Symmetry: D2
Subunit: 363 residues, 4 copies
Amino acid sequence: PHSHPALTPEQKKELSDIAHRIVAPGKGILAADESTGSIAKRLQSIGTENTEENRRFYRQLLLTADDRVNPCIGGVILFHETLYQKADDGRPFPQVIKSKGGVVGIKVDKGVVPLAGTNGETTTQGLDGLSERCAQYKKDGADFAKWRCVLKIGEHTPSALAIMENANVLARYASICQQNGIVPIVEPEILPDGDHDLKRCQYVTEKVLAAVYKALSDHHIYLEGTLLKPNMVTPGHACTQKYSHEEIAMATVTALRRTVPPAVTGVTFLSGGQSEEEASINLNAINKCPLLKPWALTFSYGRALQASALKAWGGKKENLKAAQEEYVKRALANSLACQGKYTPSGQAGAAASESLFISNHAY
Amino acid sequence: PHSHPALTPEQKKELSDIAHRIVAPGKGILAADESTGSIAKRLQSIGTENTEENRRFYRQLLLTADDRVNPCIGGVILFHETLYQKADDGRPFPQVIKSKGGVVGIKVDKGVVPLAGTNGETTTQGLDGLSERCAQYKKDGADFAKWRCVLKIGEHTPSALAIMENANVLARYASICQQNGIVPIVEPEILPDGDHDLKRCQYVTEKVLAAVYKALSDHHIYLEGTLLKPNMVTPGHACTQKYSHEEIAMATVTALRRTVPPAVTGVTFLSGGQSEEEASINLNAINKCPLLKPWALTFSYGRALQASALKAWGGKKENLKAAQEEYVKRALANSLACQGKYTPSGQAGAAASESLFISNHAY
Amino acid sequence: PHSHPALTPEQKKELSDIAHRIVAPGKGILAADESTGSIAKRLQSIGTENTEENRRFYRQLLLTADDRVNPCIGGVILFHETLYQKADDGRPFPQVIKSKGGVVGIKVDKGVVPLAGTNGETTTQGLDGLSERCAQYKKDGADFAKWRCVLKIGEHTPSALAIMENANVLARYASICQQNGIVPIVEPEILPDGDHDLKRCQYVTEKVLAAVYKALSDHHIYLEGTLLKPNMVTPGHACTQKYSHEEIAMATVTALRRTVPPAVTGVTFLSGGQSEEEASINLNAINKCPLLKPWALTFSYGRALQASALKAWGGKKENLKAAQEEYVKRALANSLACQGKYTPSGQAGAAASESLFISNHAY
Amino acid sequence: PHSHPALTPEQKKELSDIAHRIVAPGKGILAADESTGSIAKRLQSIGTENTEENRRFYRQLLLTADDRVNPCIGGVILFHETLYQKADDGRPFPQVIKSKGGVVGIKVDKGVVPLAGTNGETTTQGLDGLSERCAQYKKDGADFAKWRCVLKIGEHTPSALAIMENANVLARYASICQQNGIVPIVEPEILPDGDHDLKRCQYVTEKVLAAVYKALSDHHIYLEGTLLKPNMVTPGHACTQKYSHEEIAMATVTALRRTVPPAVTGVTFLSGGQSEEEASINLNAINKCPLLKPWALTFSYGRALQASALKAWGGKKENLKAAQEEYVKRALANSLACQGKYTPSGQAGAAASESLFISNHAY
């Protein structure tokens, strides 16, 4: 019942200013923070040896794409290794990102760990010595951080323990970040894995986010100095029932409207396995949803921004331009999408039913 | 992790439509639901005998005010007794209210009770047989309900128990209401008593509302089909430090933006002891606050709409017209205030802009 | 973090003394508090008309059994109606109970109500005006009370909400009782309905009881001034796998040892549908279980003490003696059982080996 | 509502067996796990350079005390460094401990960290990579671990956040340990700092322990395979009101009885600043307390077992024998104390008739 200010007015202004810059209109985040084990899968996917030089080259390829990406990229998330690597011109990657108008971000979690007594559920580690790490990252150019928690929809999951624990560790992580001038991106990802339908994902997402914000409140988190990186509400990857992009958008916006306080500066959606086009089309539908949305609704895409670029590269240095071109194409597409100005081919166009009305009461 | 829909799409639509009608642009709520004990004090204030006829005459006075109040009153909260009384023309009060465009509300709590082991804290009772009562009230013309919980700011209050328990009982009350087609107004009032400052009230209001919405989530409450009746964020009655209406507005809106999901259809402030003019000026400032406000910000005033009316009447039928004129003036003032168009200059629109020197980072 | 004594040392002593008297060595509780609707189903199983006189007569039959039950009965739970009824000699039933060395108890809950958004789950009502009711019951001879919450084991139950809500309302009920010199018997019954096995029931019981005691702690309940009336840990009524009495006893005592603080004065098991003989044999095995049991482990039987009595009576006055004889038999058996000195007798009738399992009204 | 066994019967047996061995009748724990920063303070108090050699020699001094300590020491907690050091004869310290009949324990927390937004409160870190560390420690001789959380009694402390967070991290630590065959000792220490009285400490201890056990339950902790290391219930260091050892014992035992499930294998009190004699006398009074205690009540002393030994050593190898003698005397004293047979000067008789004139209802 008694307040003991976690932050001063000056610290709040710094965090709010950073958070707003990242999600300024038309801007999104390039998530290029794949850890050693994750990026390995990615290079292996294109028959490329996972060496530090190849990881440096690939990251350089994305970070140095032409200026067309500047107004599309408000922030770039990097993995520790990359934060300390340099481009061919000797410039540290953080300097390269900043020179292009982007805020530098650093992934700080240390992966998921199994929760004993659960059906394969996990929590995330990485709090040990996090304050010192954050202070150093800040000095080295990073202004925001990212931490990923993973929840799964199954017969008995997400369980009460998994929801409670993941929400709690996210709050601890957020608290430590803000004490060091770092904007924490809270990522409580609910995997798309499974044959559950849209309504189920919406229900679980609503319960998970309500838990997340109650935890953030209990831990005295300054919401204006944070961003949310949630899963869009979609049917399971193996769901038999099919849905439209408008339905996905309505379910997503409704879930967020019912759980995310207006104070949260922005929502940066993870692509979670969606193809580059799917992720852009859904983000566009989300921004065109006819409901009031008090926060920026943009992207924090990893795969959905790199899929084609990685393939066009194939590990060959001579495919630099071609690979960068593919990344640019997706950055442009999503910049438009986070503004609801994206058009892939032609959409529905004709064929206007009689009984298919737009009723949000069905969600 | 499994959804068992508490409401059908049709039930949701009905609740949402009701909630929106109550807080439609320019409309607020007349809170005339004073229980037998509370109204006694009011009649006591004007040396009027507390008889059922005087209560009926007084309520009639407010309810039958001229058509000028129609676009100002989206809803009227009544006490059980009044819901079943009739105007002089034989028309049931609910019919009178509806004929003037207002939605009929019924207060359903049964008062506060002490929480053992706390420093004078309470919870509220009234859940027993509540579903049957709601079904009956709905049938008899009521479309929304009200339940008041009371919390106090003191040395060790509000305590964790008080916050948890009051939030839980409000959730139960909201759940039962929605099962019967009744829109529940959630009223977690934090009293202004004490010498605490603005920051303290804002802190407590934020913690209380965070608890309220987590509880509503745990009990599967349909937010779109609810309204919130919170205290404005103000310094304590005995606070030595003085504040401007702009600061009170900023503190209030900030607290709400950090805790109230945008899905909540509307916020109807209680006047909590503020004078009629003070309650109107503050409501106006709240609506002029530059921050983004995703819900209607209006009124649910009792004292702030009746103060002068009650005095002008003094229990004399001869002063009926003068008494109604006082009520109408306040209804008109608050109608403008909930639109940010209140000026003492009669009834204007969009007051004179000034500056943006101060910042909200100090909140 | 600050204490505000809910009770004085004097109040604690009174409650503690009462709780200990009820479960004194060799003593148990006769649960004859069946409400109007439940007792009606009992009189129907014997073709007897459900009238006030028949209920009075049946209750008199049990309460006026010979002195052999005196050492067996530490307390008797009554329903409101019975608390104010008199024996043929004009003595109020409370006086009858006291004269035989028994403590008088009163059921105060008002039945279960559905929890919206759950799969047929419930919570219990009855807190409204409970303080005044307790004050009056105390003056009229009652020293303890009982309140029943009902949980069910299923694919999605008991849900987090059901556990949390039922635990909270039990805590509220317990708090009010202790403020009025009444020892509250907390009854969080987990139904035996279903085909789940022993370990499933043990798991659920452990989770429920942990929730119950955390809530009692949050509400500042004086445990020494309380009693627990839980279900024994048994497999579902439709479970295929069979277990011995020793296994049931082990699962029951282990669950209790892992959740019930030593301060709790006693555990009075509900029979929950078990036959009179089964309930006695299991209680005996429980008391013979090797593990350390820091609390009295006795009975609070309804059906398991009345099965044979109701049948013998058959609604005929001339069968008074015969019916009372059957009750005395079960009281003696269970008195020995709660001491671990019971060894089923030669004849006990097929009525004592008959399953007293009955489903609920809803499902 | 569904169980996914965190442990197999074999795993449970191992943990339970280890826990029971550590607190076997007459046995306690030598806490010699002071981290580098803490042991530094100890050595400087006797003007000794904080070098690894001096630390190794000091720990050797304690671990190689004569066989008289064997029946007194059920377990020895070590700091990482010491677990891998060897005695002068080449034997690894863990081997030294085991040869004397003691179980080897390893402290695994990584110190306290500040909780932002609180009045100087902390949580504890150390979960990162804890599973791998436990697996390594197990392989290297350790069978139990220790983790210290610190709470403080003050104006607004311990806060709801501090209690909840520390309880949760303790549960995570406990879960990880049990997955690796390591018995976790849960240490939620409430500092004695302040002028609060005995009842205040008892209240806070009761609330903290209730929180700890609810968390252990939520995290599926096997209580039989754990030990509790709590502060005894005493007045603050600066409290002007004086209490007898019997009062301290009554408050301590009452607090534990109201919160610690019988399943918990043992309670090993920290000495927390008490002098060697005070700690022994209090532990003795605790074991003589007339109330029923379903768990072993012994010691896990650091300072209370080393004070005189550290001083007698003074960093001089020539004082080896003199120093060891002081430690041996305290080991013998506390072994008698945990049996309730300790009398500071000359023994007389272990006669235990009844207790003094102290009504437990006053607690």
